[PDB]
Ligand binder design. Structure first.
Ligand SMILES: C=C1[C@H](O)CC(=C/C=C2\CCC[C@]3(C)[C@@H]([C@H](C)[C@@H](CC)CCO)CC[C@@H]23)C[C@H]1O
Lengths: 11, 240
């Protein structure tokens, strides 16, 4: 939900 | 009484922490130099540490057994709520009771109560933060209990915005059950006595700390000039 940097890191 | 799975979990978490946490603190040089003269002089350096710490927390969280099964939205939600609490929790290893300050192996890296103040945080957040560190330090928990506590903190079903409470709860319980079982089997009296309850109490303390930090962050962060010092990761994780 608008968390690009968090999401990518978790990826 | 520790299942093979329970022992496996401990091993994974311990491994996850070692990769996630560096005792050397060698990476700290890369942050903007600490400025101790001057309002908000500490904040650039602290923001960088916090940002860096967020990355490390995220990396630990992913390794937690069953955490990956969660939906992206559930993983993101857990981390955003969790992340400040984990930083305070993780930061316990650096924290020293003698000086009452977090020690990172060097005089510049060592962080005073005033340094935290210098970032732009009032004593109401800070005094409780220091007491928490003392009270957690006093437990002298095994590394295994430290790692498990961080994992149980991250996987909280009651975090705000969690789409699927039941799944998160199922993961956490396995970690809780491991921790309880570990203290009984691997922890001798009298230090072990009440340890699970005392640890669970710390999670209640962290919720309080988290809530305070959020209010104080919002006041600091509300100001565009102060918010400008924060890293992009911090704004995303602590903002929204
Ligand atoms: C790698 C780490 C941790 O990630 C962070 C470490 C210490 C933690 C500290 C020391 C300085 C003040 C910190 C950063 C606090 C910051 C300034 C908080 C204050 C409520 C501001 C959050 O925006 C939280 C944890 C504190 C050293 C080391 O243990």
């Amino acid at each position: 939900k608008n968390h690009p940097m968090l999401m990518n890191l978790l990826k | 009484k520790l299942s093979e799975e329970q022992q496996h979990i401990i091993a994974i978490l311990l491994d996850a922490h070692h990769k996630t946490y560096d005792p050397t603190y060698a990476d700290f040089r890369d942050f903007r130099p600490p400025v101790r003269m001057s309002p908000l002089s500490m904040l650039p350096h602290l923001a960088d540490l916090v940002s860096y710490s967020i990355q490390k927390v995220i990396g630990f969280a992913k390794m937690i057994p069953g955490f990956r099964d969660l939906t992206s939205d559930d993983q993101i939600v857990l981390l955003k709520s969790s992340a400040i609490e984990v930083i305070m929790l993780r930061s316990n290893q650096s924290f020293t009771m003698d000086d009452m300050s977090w020690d990172c192996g060097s005089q510049d890296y060592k962080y005073d109560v005033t340094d935290v103040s210098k970032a732009g945080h009032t004593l109401e957040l800070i005094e409780p933060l220091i007491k928490f560190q003392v009270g957690l330090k006093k437990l002298n928990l095994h590394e295994e209990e430290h790692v498990l506590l961080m994992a149980i903190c991250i996987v909280s079903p009651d975090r705000p915005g969690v789409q699927d409470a039941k799944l998160v709860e199922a993961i956490q319980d396995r970690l809780s059950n491991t921790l309880q079982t570990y203290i009984r089997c691997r922890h001798p009296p009298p230090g072990s006595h009440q340890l699970y309850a005392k640890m669970i109490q710390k999670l209640a303390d962290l919720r309080s700390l988290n809530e305070e930090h959020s209010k104080q962050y919002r006041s600091l962060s509300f100001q565009p000039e102060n918010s400008m010092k924060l890293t992009p990761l911090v704004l995303e994780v602590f903002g929204n």
